[PDB]
Amino acid sequence: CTCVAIIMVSCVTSVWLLCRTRNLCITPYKLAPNAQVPILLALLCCIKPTRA
Amino acid sequence: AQHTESFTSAISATAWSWIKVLVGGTSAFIVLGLIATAVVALVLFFHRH
């Protein structure tokens, strides 16, 4: 029960850390619809690609 | 008979090679077919923008 608590307290520090960096990905680029994202950060380093 | 005959007692080394050829090649010929449709789909998304 301790072992499944260590994993669970470390899994909730993932979605508060991965999505925190993911929220800092696209909000500089969601405010610029006339700018093109780089393909290094579009697919590899961050998740959401260009949408039309 | 002193022994017990199993299910794979009669299959030789040549007959095992024809089984792997007639299964592995036909499985990869769909996998290549499945991966072919995953290439032009990525290409068509690049052509849209």
């Binding site: 039309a52 | 052509h47 849209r48 923008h49």
Partner: protein, 151 residues
Amino acid sequence: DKTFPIMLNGQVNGYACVVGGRVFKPLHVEGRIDNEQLAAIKLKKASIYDLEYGDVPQCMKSDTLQYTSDKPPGFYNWHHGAVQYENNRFTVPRGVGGKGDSGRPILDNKGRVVAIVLGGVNEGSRTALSVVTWNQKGVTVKDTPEGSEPW
């Protein structure tokens, strides 16, 4: 120009334009063509690109010359007005955007077809058109806005 309405049950429901090398017809509409020499054209279904087979002979070839890429955002010769943007279609006013007039081409200032409309009945205050374009080197692109009913 040269465009052919599609005859279905006595009323007009679509326009079949012709480009130099290959004729066109909207897939989402149906009916009969209005030309005797276009009755031998082999009808086929295709993808969302609205692809038809232009097997017309040389007797009526080279009607409307196509336009290349690098389209300027200036004036364009729309049949009921004008379009003044490149990446998106211009916000055409109300009145235009009724029903049953798909496949109408968009002309250039040099008399060249650059696009074929497909849909966009009504979006509200303005109207966006789901139209086909050529992106960078001549590759055919189908472009659609959000919530575009076919028209």
